[PDB]
Amino acid sequence: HVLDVGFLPDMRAAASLDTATFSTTEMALALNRYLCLAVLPLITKCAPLFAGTEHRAIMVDSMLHTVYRLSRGRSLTKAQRDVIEDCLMALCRYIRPSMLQHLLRRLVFDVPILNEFAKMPLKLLTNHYERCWKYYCLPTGWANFGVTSEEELHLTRKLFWGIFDSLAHKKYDQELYRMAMPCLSIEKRF
Amino acid sequence: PLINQYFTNHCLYFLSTPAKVLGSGGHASNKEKEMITSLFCKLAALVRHRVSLFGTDAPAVALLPVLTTLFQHIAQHQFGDDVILDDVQVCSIYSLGTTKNTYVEKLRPALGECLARLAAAMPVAFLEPQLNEYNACSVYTTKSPRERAILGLPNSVEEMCPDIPVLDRLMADIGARYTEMPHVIEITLPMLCSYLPRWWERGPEAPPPALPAGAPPPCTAVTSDHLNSLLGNILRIIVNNLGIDEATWMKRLAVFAQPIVSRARPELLHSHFIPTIGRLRKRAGKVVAEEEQLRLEAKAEAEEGELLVRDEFSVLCRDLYALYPLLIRYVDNNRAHWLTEPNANAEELFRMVGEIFIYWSKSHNFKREEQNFVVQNEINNMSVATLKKMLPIGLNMCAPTDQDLIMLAKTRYALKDTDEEVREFLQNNLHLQGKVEGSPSLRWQMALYRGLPGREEDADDPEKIVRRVQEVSAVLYHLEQTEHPY
Amino acid sequence: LLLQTNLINYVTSIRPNIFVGRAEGSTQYGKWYFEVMVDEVVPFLTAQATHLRVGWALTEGYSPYPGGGEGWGGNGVGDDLYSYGFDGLHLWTGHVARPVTSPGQHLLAPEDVVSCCLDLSVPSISFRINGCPVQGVFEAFNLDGLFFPVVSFSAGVKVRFLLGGRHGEFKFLPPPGYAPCHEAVLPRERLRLEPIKIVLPPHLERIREKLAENIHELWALTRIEQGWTYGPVRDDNKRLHPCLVNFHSLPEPERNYNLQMSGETLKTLLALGCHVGMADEKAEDNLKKTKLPKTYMMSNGYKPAPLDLSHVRLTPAQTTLVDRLAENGHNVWARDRVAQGWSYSARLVPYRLLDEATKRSNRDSLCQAVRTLLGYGYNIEDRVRIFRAEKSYTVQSGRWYFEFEAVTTGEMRVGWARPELRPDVELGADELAYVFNGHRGQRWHLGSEPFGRPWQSGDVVGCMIDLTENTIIFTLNGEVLMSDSGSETAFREIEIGDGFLPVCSLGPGQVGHLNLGQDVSSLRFFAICGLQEGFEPFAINMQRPVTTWFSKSLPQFEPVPPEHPHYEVARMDGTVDTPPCLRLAHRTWGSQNSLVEMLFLRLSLPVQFTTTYYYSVRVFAGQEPSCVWVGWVTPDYHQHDMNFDLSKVRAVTVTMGDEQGNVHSSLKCSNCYMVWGGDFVSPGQQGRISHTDLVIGCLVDLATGLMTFTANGKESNTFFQVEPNTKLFPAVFVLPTHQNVIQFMPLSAAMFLSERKNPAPQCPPRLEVQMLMPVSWSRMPNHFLQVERLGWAVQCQDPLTMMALHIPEENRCMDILELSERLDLQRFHSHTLRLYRAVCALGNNRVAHALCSHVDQAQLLH
């Protein structure tokens, strides 16, 4: 099903201002997000499903067309609950918020992504050994979050706590041995 | 930037010890410097939580040249004298309004990495000014008298010696035998400081209004100190608190000072039988005093029958206030002695005759009206491991151990004989029927095979069956406790 | 076809703690002479001929395991290739009983002496009979390991070791060039018998000059103030000191003498990874001259005025670098001395582990230099054994307890376990164990978990189990251990399963004593936590000591389990167009890519009588000739020491040659060498050459009738990759040929003894491919040999013997009692006893006479 049905949302993602009439597929998929929400399969996750996660994040951030805010919340719930059925391989989906959500100052849809971004270290603390991509994306994203949120953000307590976390998916043995690239000293970093 | 800065300090705190044991000096000192700029800041929202957390784990040799905190060594002592000296005069502000900033500064008990040349100033900086307010001072009830035991560290000063600060000023000012000549100069105050409270034997807590606020710090501290040379100070230190606690024998001594000091020093190192033989009878007398609580529940129960009187505020209002706080500290007495008592019980039956003869009424009378303890234990169980339930924790390993017939199988046979919900009056019936077994059972090589070698003089009497007749009966009431609580 | 039995004597070997090895480096002359005399009065003890023989052992034999042996019983020494021995007339190398020619061909009669000599240049071991030499000795063996002086002996043999140093009165003179414990033997230990098993940076110039001047200014003053001046006479052997000169105008020899150490200091400091920088700039100006009472003046005119360092102590860290530099310097000095010195003096050996005092002095020699530099200111920053009772003692319910004493405080574990505890797995690493570790105060079950305080010396730890309440509560010296979560030793919700069984493990260099309560009084406390709680010890009623099976170390052969995760074989049916073949498989994923997996065939190939005298390994034509030959019976197992390369297959096919029986061990991807294998091969991995030793060197009285051969050639590896040379990967079909009969052809016909005349290839189900597992289980004998001063002579008198099984196909002994846990050969042996009784049926007595040969009166009585 994730191969056959899951192909349909990828095609359906291509709707920003050109369709404006074919909202029937949007409601058809929105009213049938319970099927994916109601299960926690693929703990093994042998097949690469990072594409599905990327598409889900796209439709989460695809608020430019009609969004149907109730369906928007349904998609948010589906994406948030899908973060439990994977064994932390969605490297592209992990770096996407750094490129999009971290860059955005909670403009339109950055807060829903930041909610899951802050929820991830709760299960990733003292476990979830990092990789090369994870260890490389951790400090840049952490620095962006810890520089962007301090001053130019608002005074909203929920918005402040929406990104306020230690956010350290540190491993037990090691994650990466590539040359550190400040632009291409651990005491001065933090 | 306050909450996130404090939160990341919880995890990356102990990084000094396992990794970079000596190379972590620059990191720890660097963080502490920025934590001082918040001392002036006053905010409507409470920010004290990050203050204690930051300094709690910040400490976690001479190679610290970039450490400007070398110049910050005198900075910490600067705020020490500010509050204490001003508070001597000190009502709306006779509370934690001005002392809320002193808890984070003082608490540095174990993690010591820097010296800061603050060796003997502290005993004179705040402790001696704090001695000014030790007595009544013609002031109302003290707001935070326990800060002396808390903020006053137990000999975490790296050096103690009298007559140095008041006489040796220019000698150290001008500037390799050090801390060795005053090998006997240390014992000048304890020989006098301990003499005052011990002679004090008043009943009510009012005549000692502020006495409990100063008793813990000295005895607990110096008992550890100087253990290498003089073991006598540790020996008499056990007697020091033993005598003072005799005033706790009264059913109503303290309702707020009793728990604070009981948990202040639940420590005994030389109070066991070998160091302090009299502590057994000293605590045995406390057992008799503790038994008086049992009569309260039984006496008030008769009047509570059929709700003839106002039992709402009369029957229940008696035992909860007194019984519950007392028994916090008696548990450690048998726990420490439990390492030797069964071995001493194996050596002879007289090891814990008094202990076996006592602590029975703790559960004997508390079969019913258990709510009297729960209400007084609101601080504990509100949030299973009730202190009342763990009262026979040391007793169940000793009290039924030496009952009678050390290795004769009569113990199990007697328990089976009385396993009939036997009433107290009916307990005499089992003494006339008898139940013994010289079986070829597991008494063969291992069970009941320690006892005869361990009982060189196995005293067994027909009357001693009565002594064993009570051990199993107590277990009958304790049998339902596990199943009933659910 | 049937298992055999007979009574067999226990044999054990002991050695003095002497080690001799050779390598590219320090060797201690690598040649030694060994002497020992005998004192026995027992030509024949109760069972059979008493066995004793002397020789060497290259620290990888591990021969003595009381009980199971390679042939019949636990032979002491010389029964394998990793040992060498001599018993009066024999060259014992791998169960080979070739004798030698020498006057007085007699055993070790009382009042006889033997001399053993070892040469390092040529690998050669020779023996000296009481008055005669040997007319044939073995050579061309391995040298990678220290060679023990070992003596093997049965019951009733007493021998006296001779060293030469203090009591070794050698009757024979030592040979020309062998030193019996003269220069250094165990430098950090003693002797005792043990049972076996143009532009340059001016920064560097100024630093070096200041260091050298500051350290050399002390020498002249010390030597002129100590007053150790020469006498009036001119004595050249009085150890005159030319260094008693000024530290500036010192001559060229003194210049060279100082230059080596001064340069080596900077050379070793620049390679330590330190950071060059002026850290504090404090000691340069804070040099305070300490007070000195006016007695320092001496008539020599040179007052002792050392630099003040009484308060300048840096840290114990850089002391490690100083010690490492000192060790490197003394190692270089030792290398130089060994290169040319050859001094016959009470000479030195590698100082890395020489002794505490000398090494400490060597470290301090540079510690003074380091401290002086700091005061100046320039400062710069194989496996684990497992033990358990036999499965028959598995307990299902109750409350059970025992005590473990931890003499050493290293890696040791204690706990209970399921009966099917797989070896080769660290204790507690899976669900089949509930144990505790006291080296780190952590409990072990399916992973580590911190719990309780770690151990100390003695520290008798009690272990407990309550099958009724499913709780395991460890007790430490009479106090119950406590968990960090507020629970009492949290192993809660443990099901009954198939019952539980005590187990303990010991790491390297650890000593443990466990007491299962066979006798009441041996338990330490058992009166604080178990006396009245129903908690009742293990051996409540036993008339004999508990078996306590242990874990082997020798890598025996085991069949490939059809349930193995990533090793799947297949018995492809043999067709008309293709001979029967067997393949492999592997989980080519992130799974474990193991080492060279050694594969074996099931049955044997014993050569007749030889009719072969050689082997013919073939890849596609006549390959590397002169394949090793033995010309004896010597059953040979085909071996496939293939390397898992995450590839498809490394198959094997039972083909038929034109007129000879040959294998077809195909392979497709990468390096995998497969040749025959002996019936006693037990190697590890990581080795391709030098795995065959003890060549035959028999000769005549004139040393002229000498014939030699590559004896004991087990793994005659054929590196196939030398045959092809291409940038591709085609199939390689190696088909070695050895089977030779009259054909006027397959592998099975010769090795099954039934379809011998039939030449069609067959793979009957008796043939199963096996692998080589490293560790299996074994049974500890309930009785061992008993056994030593006045020259440390060994005295043994008590006799001890067991009755032992035998597997003719696999050719290896084993104690009969192992059948109490095997339960697969026990049933077969009971049925074969029933067959013996049936064939000795009612009213028959010829068959009874025949049967009194397979068994014996003494064996039945035992």
Short mmCIF file of C-alpha atoms in Angstrom, two decimals, chain B residues 58-340:
data_model
loop_
_atom_site.label_atom_id
_atom_site.label_comp_id
_atom_site.label_asym_id
_atom_site.label_seq_id
_atom_site.Cartn_x
_atom_site.Cartn_y
_atom_site.Cartn_z
CA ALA B 58 30.02 23.70 37.51
CA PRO B 59 33.15 22.38 39.33
CA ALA B 60 32.18 18.87 38.13
CA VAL B 61 46.42 22.48 38.59
CA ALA B 62 48.55 25.60 38.10
CA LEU B 63 47.96 25.65 34.32
CA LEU B 64 45.21 28.26 34.25
CA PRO B 65 46.80 31.50 32.98
CA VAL B 66 43.90 32.54 30.75
CA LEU B 67 41.59 31.92 33.73
CA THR B 68 40.66 35.44 34.81
CA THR B 69 38.60 33.64 37.49
CA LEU B 70 41.90 33.68 39.39
CA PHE B 71 40.98 37.32 39.96
CA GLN B 72 37.39 36.23 40.70
CA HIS B 73 38.52 34.25 43.76
CA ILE B 74 37.96 37.24 46.04
CA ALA B 75 34.64 38.01 44.32
CA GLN B 76 32.78 35.15 46.01
CA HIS B 77 33.85 36.19 49.51
CA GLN B 78 32.60 39.72 48.80
CA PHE B 79 28.92 38.77 48.85
CA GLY B 80 29.38 36.47 51.85
CA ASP B 81 29.65 39.30 54.38
CA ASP B 82 27.01 41.53 52.76
CA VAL B 83 23.85 39.71 53.85
CA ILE B 84 25.00 38.38 57.23
CA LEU B 85 26.36 41.69 58.53
CA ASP B 86 23.28 43.61 57.38
CA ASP B 87 20.92 40.91 58.67
CA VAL B 88 22.28 41.14 62.24
CA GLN B 89 19.71 43.86 62.91
CA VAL B 90 17.02 41.71 61.28
CA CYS B 91 8.53 41.37 60.77
CA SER B 92 7.83 41.23 57.03
CA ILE B 93 11.50 40.85 56.01
CA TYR B 94 12.38 38.39 58.80
CA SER B 95 12.03 35.59 56.26
CA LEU B 96 13.68 34.20 53.11
CA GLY B 97 13.31 37.57 51.36
CA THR B 98 16.99 38.41 51.84
CA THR B 99 18.42 34.90 52.34
CA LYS B 100 17.13 33.56 49.00
CA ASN B 101 20.48 34.43 47.38
CA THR B 102 22.76 32.57 49.83
CA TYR B 103 21.95 28.92 49.08
CA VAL B 104 23.68 28.70 45.70
CA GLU B 105 26.88 30.35 46.94
CA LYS B 106 27.51 28.16 49.98
CA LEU B 107 26.78 24.65 48.69
CA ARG B 108 30.09 23.25 47.41
CA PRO B 109 30.55 20.12 49.52
CA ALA B 110 32.56 17.71 47.36
CA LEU B 111 33.48 19.15 43.95
CA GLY B 112 36.62 21.04 44.91
CA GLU B 113 39.04 21.97 42.14
CA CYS B 114 40.20 25.51 43.03
CA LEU B 115 41.56 26.86 46.31
CA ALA B 116 40.89 30.61 45.86
CA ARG B 117 42.99 31.34 49.00
CA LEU B 118 39.72 31.39 51.00
CA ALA B 119 40.97 29.14 53.79
CA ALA B 120 40.01 30.62 57.18
CA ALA B 121 38.08 33.79 56.29
CA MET B 122 34.76 31.93 56.10
CA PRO B 123 34.73 30.78 59.77
CA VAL B 124 35.05 34.48 60.62
CA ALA B 125 33.30 35.95 57.55
CA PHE B 126 29.82 34.60 58.27
CA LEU B 127 30.00 31.85 60.89
CA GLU B 128 31.16 34.10 63.72
CA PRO B 129 28.60 36.81 62.75
CA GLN B 130 26.03 34.01 62.60
CA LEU B 131 27.02 33.15 66.18
CA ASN B 132 25.69 36.59 67.17
CA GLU B 133 22.14 35.49 66.30
CA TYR B 134 22.52 32.02 67.84
CA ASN B 135 20.88 33.07 71.11
CA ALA B 136 17.45 34.65 71.53
CA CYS B 137 18.50 38.23 70.65
CA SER B 138 15.06 39.27 71.99
CA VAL B 139 13.56 38.55 68.57
CA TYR B 140 10.61 36.49 67.38
CA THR B 141 10.78 32.87 66.22
CA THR B 142 13.65 32.40 63.79
CA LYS B 143 12.70 32.25 60.11
CA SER B 144 15.51 30.06 58.71
CA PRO B 145 17.59 28.68 61.59
CA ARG B 146 18.38 25.50 59.62
CA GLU B 147 20.50 27.47 57.14
CA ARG B 148 23.39 27.22 59.62
CA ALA B 149 23.47 23.43 59.23
CA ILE B 150 22.91 23.65 55.46
CA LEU B 151 24.95 26.67 54.37
CA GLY B 152 27.50 25.88 57.06
CA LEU B 153 29.36 23.07 55.36
CA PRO B 154 30.45 20.06 57.48
CA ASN B 155 34.19 20.77 57.59
CA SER B 156 34.32 21.51 53.85
CA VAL B 157 36.81 24.30 54.51
CA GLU B 158 40.11 22.47 53.76
CA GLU B 159 41.64 23.82 57.01
CA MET B 160 40.52 24.37 60.60
CA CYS B 161 42.54 25.84 63.46
CA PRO B 162 41.68 28.22 66.32
CA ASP B 163 43.55 31.35 67.43
CA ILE B 164 44.97 31.80 63.90
CA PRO B 165 42.54 34.44 62.51
CA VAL B 166 42.55 36.51 65.71
CA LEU B 167 46.33 36.32 66.30
CA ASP B 168 48.10 35.17 63.10
CA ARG B 169 47.54 38.08 60.71
CA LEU B 170 50.94 39.56 59.83
CA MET B 171 52.64 36.15 60.04
CA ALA B 172 50.79 34.95 56.94
CA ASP B 173 50.78 38.50 55.53
CA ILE B 174 54.58 38.51 55.21
CA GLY B 175 54.56 35.01 53.73
CA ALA B 176 57.77 23.82 54.61
CA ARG B 177 55.91 22.56 57.69
CA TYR B 178 52.26 23.55 57.22
CA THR B 179 48.99 22.22 58.67
CA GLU B 180 51.04 19.79 60.78
CA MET B 181 52.14 21.81 63.83
CA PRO B 182 48.45 22.41 64.88
CA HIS B 183 48.01 18.64 65.11
CA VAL B 184 46.58 19.06 68.63
CA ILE B 185 45.42 22.67 68.23
CA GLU B 186 42.37 21.42 66.30
CA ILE B 187 40.75 19.99 69.45
CA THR B 188 40.15 23.22 71.34
CA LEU B 189 36.51 24.08 70.53
CA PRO B 190 35.00 20.55 70.31
CA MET B 191 36.10 19.77 73.88
CA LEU B 192 34.10 22.88 74.87
CA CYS B 193 31.44 23.12 72.16
CA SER B 194 30.18 19.60 72.89
CA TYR B 195 30.14 20.19 76.66
CA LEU B 196 27.29 22.73 76.61
CA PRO B 197 24.39 20.86 74.90
CA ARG B 198 25.16 17.55 76.63
CA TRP B 199 24.66 18.95 80.13
CA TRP B 200 21.36 20.46 78.93
CA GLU B 201 18.46 18.20 79.95
CA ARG B 202 15.32 20.34 79.73
CA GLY B 203 12.02 18.75 78.77
CA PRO B 204 10.12 21.22 76.59
CA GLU B 205 11.54 22.64 73.37
CA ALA B 206 10.94 26.24 74.46
CA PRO B 207 13.96 26.46 76.84
CA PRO B 208 16.12 25.31 73.90
CA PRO B 209 14.54 27.67 71.34
CA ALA B 210 17.48 27.89 68.92
CA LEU B 211 19.59 25.05 70.34
CA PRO B 212 18.73 22.53 67.56
CA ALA B 213 19.84 25.05 64.91
CA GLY B 214 23.48 24.67 65.95
CA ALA B 215 23.78 21.10 67.21
CA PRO B 216 24.19 19.30 63.82
CA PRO B 217 27.06 21.23 62.14
CA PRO B 218 29.92 20.67 64.65
CA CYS B 219 29.51 17.04 65.68
CA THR B 220 28.81 15.73 62.18
CA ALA B 221 31.77 17.61 60.70
CA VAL B 222 34.65 16.96 63.10
CA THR B 223 33.63 13.31 63.58
CA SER B 224 34.91 12.60 60.07
CA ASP B 225 37.84 14.97 60.59
CA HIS B 226 41.09 13.67 62.11
CA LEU B 227 40.07 10.01 61.95
CA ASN B 228 43.61 8.94 61.01
CA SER B 229 45.22 9.83 64.36
CA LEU B 230 42.58 10.28 67.09
CA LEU B 231 39.82 7.66 67.08
CA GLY B 232 38.55 8.85 70.47
CA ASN B 233 36.76 11.86 68.98
CA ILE B 234 34.68 9.52 66.81
CA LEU B 235 34.03 7.34 69.86
CA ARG B 236 32.55 10.08 72.05
CA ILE B 237 30.79 11.69 69.07
CA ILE B 238 28.28 8.83 69.10
CA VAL B 239 27.60 9.53 72.78
CA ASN B 240 27.18 13.23 71.97
CA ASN B 241 23.98 12.85 69.96
CA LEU B 242 22.90 9.84 72.04
CA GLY B 243 22.55 11.96 75.17
CA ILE B 244 20.82 14.86 73.42
CA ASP B 245 18.16 12.59 71.89
CA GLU B 246 17.05 11.48 75.37
CA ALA B 247 14.87 14.60 75.39
CA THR B 248 12.92 13.06 72.50
CA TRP B 249 11.48 10.45 74.89
CA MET B 250 8.50 12.68 75.71
CA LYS B 251 5.45 12.13 73.51
CA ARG B 252 5.37 15.83 72.55
CA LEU B 253 8.79 17.48 72.17
CA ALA B 254 8.74 19.06 68.70
CA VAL B 255 6.26 19.25 65.82
CA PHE B 256 8.61 20.99 63.36
CA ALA B 257 12.10 20.68 64.86
CA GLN B 258 11.72 16.91 65.34
CA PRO B 259 11.78 15.97 61.62
CA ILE B 260 14.39 18.59 60.64
CA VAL B 261 17.04 17.35 63.06
CA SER B 262 16.08 13.67 62.78
CA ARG B 263 16.92 13.74 59.06
CA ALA B 264 19.81 16.15 59.65
CA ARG B 265 22.20 13.47 60.96
CA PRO B 266 20.82 9.90 60.69
CA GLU B 267 24.47 8.89 61.05
CA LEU B 268 26.05 6.49 63.53
CA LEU B 269 29.53 5.02 63.09
CA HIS B 270 30.57 4.21 66.68
CA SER B 271 27.15 3.68 68.28
CA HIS B 272 26.99 -0.10 67.73
CA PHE B 273 27.35 -2.70 70.48
CA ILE B 274 31.15 -2.98 70.34
CA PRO B 275 31.77 0.82 70.43
CA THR B 276 28.71 1.69 72.56
CA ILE B 277 27.33 -1.30 74.47
CA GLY B 278 24.93 0.94 76.38
CA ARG B 279 23.28 2.15 73.16
CA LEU B 280 21.32 -1.12 73.16
CA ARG B 281 19.68 -0.35 76.51
CA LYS B 282 19.70 3.36 75.65
CA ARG B 283 17.53 2.63 72.62
CA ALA B 284 15.65 -0.08 74.54
CA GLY B 285 14.37 2.62 76.87
CA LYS B 286 13.18 4.49 73.79
CA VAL B 287 11.26 1.35 72.79
CA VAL B 288 9.30 1.50 76.05
CA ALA B 289 8.52 5.16 75.39
CA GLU B 290 7.45 4.29 71.84
CA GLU B 291 5.04 1.66 73.20
CA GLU B 292 2.97 4.42 74.84
CA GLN B 293 1.64 5.41 71.42
CA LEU B 294 -0.04 1.99 71.15
CA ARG B 295 -2.21 2.56 74.23
CA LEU B 296 -3.58 5.77 72.69
CA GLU B 297 -5.25 3.99 69.77
CA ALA B 298 -6.67 1.24 71.99
CA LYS B 299 -7.94 3.65 74.65
CA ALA B 300 -9.62 6.07 72.25
CA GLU B 301 -11.16 3.16 70.32
CA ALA B 302 -13.41 2.19 73.24
CA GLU B 303 -14.96 5.66 73.39
CA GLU B 304 -15.32 5.71 69.59
CA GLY B 305 -17.74 2.76 69.69
CA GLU B 306 -21.09 3.33 67.96
CA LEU B 307 -20.17 7.02 67.50
CA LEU B 308 -21.48 7.81 70.98
CA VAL B 309 -19.28 10.92 71.22
CA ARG B 310 -17.75 13.45 68.82
CA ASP B 311 -15.18 11.04 67.39
CA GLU B 312 -14.55 13.37 64.44
CA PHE B 313 -12.07 15.55 66.35
CA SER B 314 -11.44 13.57 69.57
CA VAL B 315 -10.60 9.91 68.86
CA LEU B 316 -8.53 10.47 65.72
CA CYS B 317 -6.79 13.67 66.85
CA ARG B 318 -4.54 11.89 69.38
CA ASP B 319 -1.98 9.56 67.79
CA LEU B 320 -1.33 11.19 64.40
CA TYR B 321 0.55 14.18 65.79
CA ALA B 322 3.02 12.28 67.99
CA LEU B 323 3.53 8.70 66.79
CA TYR B 324 4.38 9.32 63.13
CA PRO B 325 7.40 11.69 63.29
CA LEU B 326 9.26 9.79 66.02
CA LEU B 327 10.25 6.54 64.31
CA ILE B 328 12.10 8.06 61.33
CA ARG B 329 15.57 7.53 62.83
CA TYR B 330 15.24 4.26 64.79
CA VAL B 331 15.38 2.21 61.57
CA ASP B 332 19.11 2.84 61.09
CA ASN B 333 19.90 1.53 64.59
CA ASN B 334 19.00 -2.08 63.78
CA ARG B 335 20.09 -1.76 60.14
CA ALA B 336 23.68 -1.02 61.17
CA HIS B 337 23.53 -3.68 63.91
CA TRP B 338 22.00 -6.24 61.51
CA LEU B 339 25.47 -6.94 60.09
CA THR B 340 26.62 -8.38 63.43
#
